[PDB]
Amino acid sequence: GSLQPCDHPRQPCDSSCPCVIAQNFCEKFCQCSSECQNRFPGCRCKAQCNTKQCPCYLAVRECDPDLCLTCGAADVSCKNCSIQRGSKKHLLLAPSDVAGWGIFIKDPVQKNEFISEYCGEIISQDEADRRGKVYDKYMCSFLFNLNNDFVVDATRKGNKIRFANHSVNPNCYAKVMMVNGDHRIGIFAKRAIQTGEELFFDYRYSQA
Ligand SMILES: [Zn+2]
Ligand SMILES: [Zn+2]
Ligand SMILES: [Zn+2]
Ligand SMILES: [Zn+2]
Ligand SMILES: [Zn+2]
Ligand SMILES: [Zn+2]
């Protein structure tokens, strides 16, 4: 059960806690003490927080304003707070070099660098399969597979990066990240990308 808070009033998060059994950190939604030993401790980085040297970056979570007290998360020296702050690289929507409409990056990025949140509704494959066969009011829809269980629907609540085209050889990928207790989708560069290049995702399975 993904994102299930534990709730065992007056009891600690021991080997009887579902979070501990399933081997996941206790999160913001869990009813346990803020001092719970099964919670994520955050980081004490000096800045950046964009390499495996950062505990938060490594655990696929953004830094936490009330836990990451040195890196800049509580203040833009921390580069692991972008989804929270609504920060992103500059992107251009333009006619694709391939065909139709495309997204072109306007800032250079390095391999594994954050580009933008991919906004939308995270839904199950079941809910996606429904929307797919059922009569819909929206004409032009935007959806891709995160993995084999979940899809992002960017039709109603998407942002500009939803216009990025499909490729089985993509230059970008998606991370499902823990962001202040919620799962949010980050788009990262799969390789170094120069300014003016078109961005591509693998729609089959974007979570690389
Ligand atoms: Zn617990
Ligand atoms: Zn818990
Ligand atoms: Zn706990
Ligand atoms: Zn850090
Ligand atoms: Zn941190
Ligand atoms: Zn940080």
Residue numbers in the entry: 523 to 597, 604 to 736
Direct quotes from the study:
Methylation of histone (H3K27) by PRC complexes is believed to be catalyzed by its conserved SET-domain containing member, Enhancer of zeste [E(z)]. EZH2 is the human homolog of E(z), the C-terminal SET domain of which is the most conserved region of the protein by primary sequence. Unlike other SET domains, i.e., SET7, SET8, and SUV39H1, EZH2 is inactive on its own and requires binding partners (SUZ12 and EED) for activity. EZH2 sequence mutations, expression levels, and copy number aberrations are correlated with the incidence and aggressiveness of various cancers and other diseases.
EZH2-SET crystallized in the space group P212121 with one copy per asymmetric unit. The final model consisted of one EZH2-SET domain (chain A) containing a total of 209 residues, 6 zinc atoms, 159 water molecules, and 1 sulfate ion. Found within the pre-SET domain N-terminal to the SET domain, there are two three-atom clusters of bound zinc coordinated by two distinct nine-residue constellations. The tertiary structure of the SET domain is similar to that of previously determined SET domain crystal structures. The core of the SET domain is formed by a three-stranded (β-3, β-7, β-8) anti-parallel β-sheet pressed diagonally across a second smaller three-stranded (β-4, β-5, β-6) anti-parallel β-sheet. Unlike many of its homologs, the C-terminal Post-SET domain of EZH2 does not encode a zinc-binding motif and is largely disordered in the crystal structure. Rather than looping outward and downward after the conserved tyrosine at position 731 to form the lower lobe of the SAM cofactor binding site, the C-terminus turns upwards and packs against the loop between β-strands 5 and 6 and the outer edge of β-7 with the backbone oxygen of the C-terminal Y731 forming a hydrogen bond with the backbone nitrogen of β-5 N673. When compared with structurally homologous SET domains, it appears that the conformation of the C-terminus in this position would impair both cofactor and substrate binding. The Y646, F672, F729, and Y731 aromatic side chains form a tightly packed hydrophobic core which occludes the lysine substrate binding channel. In those structures, the C-terminal post-SET domain forms part of the cofactor binding site without a zinc stabilized motif. It is likely that, in EZH2, a competent cofactor binding site is only formed upon binding to other components of the PRC2 complex.
